Amino acid sequence: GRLVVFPNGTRKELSADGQTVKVMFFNGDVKHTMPDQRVIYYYAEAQTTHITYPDGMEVLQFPNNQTVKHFPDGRKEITFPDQTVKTLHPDGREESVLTDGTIIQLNPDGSKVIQFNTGQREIHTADFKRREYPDGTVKTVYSDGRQETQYPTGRVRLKDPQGKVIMDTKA
């Protein structure tokens, strides 16, 4: 049950059972250090809880009920109250998994990819919006209005903006 009061008012007190080292900082921050070396830190101003594990993993819990987990591999995973999980990868990719299973990926090249739970995949770039279907069919609409269908057979059919076929090839 040791107690140290530092000249600045910060208190360090061991729990009655000897297991938790509790620091109450003069600014209202509180730190608990556990036997397994887990550190739990409450930031009073931000009202945020920050847990640091021995392996270096960190988890933050914010007032708005968001959680952010920092993984040793460099990923940062943000969980929203509604169950949406957003992962930030080291390469700059951001992938959100919605509660219905939909995946929305934001890529460092400007593109947005949506993977629907039906297998269908939508790719949006500055130059086109493309839909890929599980069988191998691809429909691409260009910013200029041209439309290309690739069939799983190798056939590629291209149409002008009015829908007139201007190219239809197959090997």
Residue numbers in the entry: 954 to 1124
Publication excerpt:
Intriguingly, a MCPH mutation (E1235V) in the conserved C-terminal domain of CPAP (the so-called TCP-domain or G-Box) appeared to weaken this yeast-two-hybrid interaction. The involvement of CPAP E1021 in the interaction with STIL in zebrafish is potentially significant, as the equivalent residue in human CPAP (E1235) is mutated to valine in some MCPH patients. To test whether this mutation disrupts the organisation of the TCP domain, we obtained the crystal structure of D. rerio CPAP937–1124 carrying the E1021V mutation. Taken together these results lend strong support to our structural model and indicate that the E1021V MCPH mutation leads to roughly an order of magnitude decrease in affinity of the CPAP–STIL interaction. The structures we report here reveal that E1235 is one of the several residues involved in the binding interface with STIL, making an important sidechain–mainchain contact. This structural model explains how the E1235V mutation can compromise complex formation, and we have confirmed that this is the case with zebrafish proteins in vitro.
Of particular interest in this regard is the putative centriolar CPAP–STIL complex, as mutations in both components result in MCPH. Our mutational analysis of the interface demonstrates a remarkable correlation between the ability of mutant proteins to bind to one another in vitro and their ability to support centriole assembly in vivo, providing compelling support for our structural model of the metazoan CPAP–STIL complex. These data strongly suggest that the interaction between CPAP and STIL is a conserved, essential step in centriole biogenesis.
